[PDB]
Design a protein around this ligand. Structure first.
Ligand SMILES: NC[C@@H]1O[C@H](O[C@H]2[C@@H](O)[C@H](O[C@@H]3[C@@H](O)[C@H](N)C[C@H](N)[C@H]3O[C@H]3O[C@H](CO)[C@@H](O)[C@H](O)[C@H]3N)O[C@@H]2CO)[C@H](N)[C@@H](O)[C@@H]1O
Ligand SMILES: NC[C@@H]1O[C@H](O[C@H]2[C@@H](O)[C@H](O[C@@H]3[C@@H](O)[C@H](N)C[C@H](N)[C@H]3O[C@H]3O[C@H](CO)[C@@H](O)[C@H](O)[C@H]3N)O[C@@H]2CO)[C@H](N)[C@@H](O)[C@@H]1O
Ligand SMILES: NC[C@@H]1O[C@H](O[C@H]2[C@@H](O)[C@H](O[C@@H]3[C@@H](O)[C@H](N)C[C@H](N)[C@H]3O[C@H]3O[C@H](CO)[C@@H](O)[C@H](O)[C@H]3N)O[C@@H]2CO)[C@H](N)[C@@H](O)[C@@H]1O
Ligand SMILES: NC[C@@H]1O[C@H](O[C@H]2[C@@H](O)[C@H](O[C@@H]3[C@@H](O)[C@H](N)C[C@H](N)[C@H]3O[C@H]3O[C@H](CO)[C@@H](O)[C@H](O)[C@H]3N)O[C@@H]2CO)[C@H](N)[C@@H](O)[C@@H]1O
Lengths: 402, 402, 402, 402
């Protein structure tokens, strides 16, 4: 009783049927405008579902969004943004997920995309299907009362107080400038902008209505919120800056607010904030989570489209235990650019598709993977070269979650 | 108007004074015998104090340890380790601290040391003097019952259950082989060993009673504790491993304790553990914090000491605002080795000595300091090269605190 | 080089700038018709703001409300209620505050107000400007199920349960009766009652709709809420009694609710609630925090207005390091009343202006101040006599906060 | 059934009976040396027990310690400190406690004591027996990191660190100088001093070993304590200060412990500590609670021993539902000194014996009692004159627990 039919387009009864299943698997009723916004991002032939005994509702679902992701060196690639994946609580353990994934990857594949990307949702299983953790989110916390900036620290001022809803075109532009300069940057449709700034109480979790700071080269969205204390603290929801001074002047404004005791952000790994303060201990790094996951769908494409931090000439055997996207490729990186030729010479390096996925925005070291035999070579030193080559120019940051 | 006094040698009465201040200053301190080992490690003319208006106990105290740190590429350097620094709460008011630091650091240079090192005390100002954070601890924490090793991951066995005090010599040179390999490695006199494996109730601190896992190329000391819940959790006091075989093996043993709920450790930034499991989410990285602070006491000595990761030719002006260990240097790095001579040439890159110290073990990135003007160049990729070169290839781990 | 600017009258696109600033600066934006009411209370030429270089929103703002304060002895003085003072977290450190406070106080002075009053908010630098804490607020928690009145203790009854809104006038009259009897007493404009009984969800925390109790001489507003447990307790929001029996009878009421585990109230220091029980231990006193602060603007005006508890023939040297309302005064107090007149004699007692302020409503002892050398006299008993004089019969208590 | 007998002295076998019953009723068995300390204090014919059927153990116990309370004006009286009151939880609800108290209070009365005193515990019924709350213990905490002393504030200097053990005499001497100035000052026998510095761990509340700060005119005693999250608060157990400076100097000391995030203390109502800080808000009053309770045994003797702050000539009717120590009394106060003789004329103020005991150290304001009818007079300004007379120059602080 398992066959998946790929929706050519998402009718209003299909979406209703999907927002039912999705509601069970993900929690709240993301509001009408938020999902419509999401629905608008779905290329056609991009929704694989599995119906029930009587085709009244769905008992499995998936889809990818049509996205454009920046990779190191600056190129944008179109990526397939896998999401709204759910199998009914009732039908699990009967292999619905796998069936539906194969069909969605053959659709993702035929539709052209070089990379597939997701965020991890609880209970998901991703490694064996070839997805690796590509970016890291690091929650960092500053007690504003004791933080005090370093002498050398920039102090560019020129930060306006903003109503975010009134500067859609303004913000969205700042974001775009950063997007083009930062790996992990997704393009964000006017749809989502419209929907973010709206400040739906629903999507709202973690504070009240939305405050915003503005700079010619950056902006910051944050919410205030009280604890059991009475004592409030600020949570930064997005802080996007395109110049160092943007970034600095914003952090300066943020620790400006006398109302609040702490400010926390969910940032990327090497954020400059601590180095801005006289003493790094004043900023308090308190978690490191996975953010963006990545299945490389077409090796040569993906590997050539990005730039490299060291030079390397090697044959690379990619294991793929789900599809046939691997094989042996000849990686040849010359002045930080690659030419990734299909081969059947012997290999220098064996790598599982999920770990090629992960290295890819330069967020990892071969150290963990190698020591875990997901990254093999008779030649210890070459494997260090490989990692250096794949290391990132700039710290990856996913633009937004999906 | 206050002059400090260098003690040619620390007497029983001195030490009593020193112990008394350091108790008020650091909290009811180590046992008598731990104190005895630290004392053991203080060379001559290495103690600076500000005597009380009449000498009973001191108003100000500082000394340094004779130590031996490992730098990248395995060279070992003698380093001065600034410990038991403290100003009696009754004189934190009047500039005692700078007085001692000036004298103590004078002493440290008269003695030859290329580096001064310390771990941070609450209340200490540090970069002012040229100490920068040079290594990092991530607090990783795995939920045993849900963790799961990767199918790929090595399962070498080789683990012996241990009573720790009973293989003091064995453990001790596993740790040496490690020390010799890892940047950050402090030598560890047997005085310190016998103190730790003595496993004293006061110096137990956070948990129950040391357990040990032994292995031909690694050990793991841990303590179990249970809190209000009724449920236990292991905390790893130290895990030293020389092979990735030792490490996997040790970690397999660790996540084998049915007794245990979570297993916490305090380790370096790019630890194999999460890569060893099927889903990097099973391991939960929580907090990242400073470990080891460095002040470079002799730029050419220390710069020539380690090895590097790109080539580099640059003239470096190094800004010290405490002593005069500053100045313009030719930094010439090829094939890893560096030649660093003093010069009158115009500088390509300015750098503040406290950030030169931080970068010294390969720990950070340039982006942060650059962003804050603690590191400048009109050429923006000269910087990117400089950084690229100072980077490490073994994550730096401070050997123990002091 | 900043010149501030007085708004002779508040515009609509003036009130817009002010709310926006205020929202950035005090957490939430209180409901519209809350703002409407306050703004209703701002007299002419009583708003001081600082425009941006652009002059689009405000980067500094402050204003006073014209009010009506009761002092020891029942006299009622007009008082500048300093409110909404706020500085954009962007132009911080630019000392706009001194620029504004200095104009806003010239205004207050021109207007002829004897006192200025405020409630404190985070970051507020207040003593520095001659403000002093003038009333104290004790929080109290009775656990109903073990509480029980004393045998001797009044049981008048006469408490109706009310719906708050419907007896707006009735409430208002009762309040007013209290006000004229109780130093601390602010007049409450009808605008404000309306907004109070209105009970909009947005400035309710913590609890639900607003329950109430009505005695001929007293009333009690409160909210109930489920906490974590989730067991319920009642926050008394405001309880006003003119006679001991309304006090008794209302407390009786409050403690007879059943949902309730405990009843909590913020109230003044010598509240007879605990004296009303068989054991004061039933009535847990939780905190003691600042409420109303006072800056004496016209020393003679203000001193003369109230009346006193001891006699006193002393020469006062009020010290003011912000403005110039200092000087030496012959303060002679005979049987209640004081004639304070400016003079040239040397001093007996010297006294910082912020101290005179806090001492004004009686709720301090001179001991603390004297110890700090904020209250200096060479004559030891003179000081203790000053205290004697400035004490008061009715415990001071602010009417409501702003 | 119940017939209490009054031990002439305590024999070693009698003490074990009491230590037995005490453990059941109080939990920790105070170390041997503690118990001896108290035994030391128990005078002749001062122990009252009820034995059980076999006459092997006791099923009800009580005694009083011979003590020395300091009352207003600085005169010391001998007071009977009721201690160690127990009833076997087996024989509770049989009237054991009233029986025991009645005889204990003749012993006290016939002994010649004008005051019984105790620190309340458990349940703890105390009102009816004539005991009222006499002194108050307000808990204060200071976030050390944020607190600043007011510029005006003494910085007297003069504080040393100590091993408090090695300074018992000079400590006790300072304590003595304080005890004779402060109402509530108990005399502290060497035995007790010896037991406090004994620092035994099974009587150690609020931290680890004892720290000391000594001044010639005061000392602070505190423990340090580490929270779940590894940050230390330091809790003062005793801060005895004989002059203003010593008080300033010691706080100035305490707040200078970089180790410590907050300091806390259980102190008296009007301590100067918040007044010493530039903003009183950095100090936080966090509880207010009963300390010492008092029963007046002999009204005339007691009222004559203390001094007063006003004058009055009144007939005082003292209620008493447990003994007949009440009566009507001519109370005339002038010069702050009172003569009090029995009189048969008719009364102006009728007073419960609770509230005379409670009002005795000048703690309370009479408004509370009067509202609750435990204090009564027609003439409403007579109550007011009574209270005014009964207030106290020095804030009262119990010397130590018992
Ligand atoms: N594949 C899992 C996905 O889970 C989704 O649910 C959400 C979450 O799972 C995901 O949360 C990500 C988290 O994975 C991730 N490890 C870290 C990240 N901080 C979170 O994202 C969060 O931060 C960014 C703000 O910059 C926002 O874009 C996002 O709304 C917010 N929830 O962001 C998704 C969108 O808010 C979808 N319900 C589902 O379509 C999809 O399948
Ligand atoms: N100069 C500053 C120093 O502060 C010191 O303070 C002690 C602690 O602050 C320091 O603790 C460090 C901590 O700062 C640091 N941020 C991280 C580190 N993990 C802790 O160290 C801890 O872990 C290591 C191994 O992990 C152990 O060997 C060590 O005993 C343990 N305390 O280790 C020191 C000794 O435990 C000393 N009191 C003193 O010698 C010295 O003045
Ligand atoms: N300068 C502080 C001013 O506070 C205002 O904001 C609020 C707070 O400052 C103020 O809070 C005060 C608090 O300061 C104060 N130290 C103690 C008091 N418990 C609180 O007030 C609270 O209690 C009283 C009744 O008990 C209520 O009337 C009041 O609405 C309530 N918020 O009550 C105001 C709410 O009406 C104004 N936005 C602004 O003028 C400025 O922030
Ligand atoms: N309640 C009756 C008494 O309780 C005693 O037990 C102890 C406690 O009751 C009493 O604790 C009191 C507390 O009741 C009291 N109402 C408030 C006070 N904070 C506590 O006292 C505490 O702080 C004081 C300093 O103020 C310290 O001297 C003392 O170590 C500490 N116990 O201090 C007593 C001894 O430390 C006796 N076992 C008993 O003889 C006696 O009947």
């Amino acid at each position: 009783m398992i066959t998946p039919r790929t929706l050519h387009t998402i009718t209003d009864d299909d979406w209703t049927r999907i927002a039912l299943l999705a509601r069970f698997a993900f929690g709240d009723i993301e509001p009408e405008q938020t999902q419509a916004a999401w629905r608008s991002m779905v290329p056609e032939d991009a929704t694989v579902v599995v119906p029930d005994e009587t085709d009244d509702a769905f008992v499995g679902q998936s889809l990818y969004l049509d996205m454009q992701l920046t990779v190191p060196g600056g190129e944008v690639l179109p990526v397939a943004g896998i999401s709204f994946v759910a199998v009914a609580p009732t039908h699990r353990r009967r292999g619905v997920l796998r069936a539906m994934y194969t069909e969605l990857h053959d659709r993702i594949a035929r539709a052209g995309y070089p990379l597939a990307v997701l965020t991890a949702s609880e209970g998901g299983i991703y490694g064996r299907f070839g997805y690796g953790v590509a970016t890291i989110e690091q929650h960092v916390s500053v007690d504003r009362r004791l933080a005090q900036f370093h002498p050398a620290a920039p102090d560019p001022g020129g930060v306006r107080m903003l109503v975010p809803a009134d500067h859609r075109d303004g913000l969205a532009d700042i974001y775009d400038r950063w997007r083009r300069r930062t790996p992990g940057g997704l393009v964000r449709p006017d749809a989502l902008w419209d929907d973010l700034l709206a400040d739906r109480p629903e999507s709202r979790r973690g504070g009240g209505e939305l405050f915003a700071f503005g700079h010619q080269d950056g902006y910051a969205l944050y919410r205030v919120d009280r604890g059991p204390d009475g004592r409030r603290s600020a949570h930064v929801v997005e802080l996007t800056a395109v110049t160092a001074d943007a970034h600095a002047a914003l952090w300066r404004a943020l620790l400006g607010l006398d109302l609040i005791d702490r400010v926390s952000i969910g940032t990327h790994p090497h954020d400059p904030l601590p180095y801005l303060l006289t003493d790094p201990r004043q900023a308090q790094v308190t978690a490191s989570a996975d953010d963006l996951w990545i299945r490389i769908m077409n090796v040569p494409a993906a590997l050539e489209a990005r730039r490299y931090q060291a030079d390397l000439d090697v044959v690379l055997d990619v294991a793929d235990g789900f599809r046939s996207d691997g094989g042996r490729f000849a990686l040849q990186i010359s002045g930080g650019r690659a030419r990734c030729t299909t081969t059947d010479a012997p290999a220098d390096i064996e790598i599982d598709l999920d770990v090629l996925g992960g290295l890819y925005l330069g967020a990892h070291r071969v150290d963990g993977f190698a020591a875990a035999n997901r990254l093999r070579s008779k030649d210890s030193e070459l494997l260090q070269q490989f990692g250096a080559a794949f290391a990132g120019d700039m710290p990856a940051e996913l633009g937004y979650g999906f």
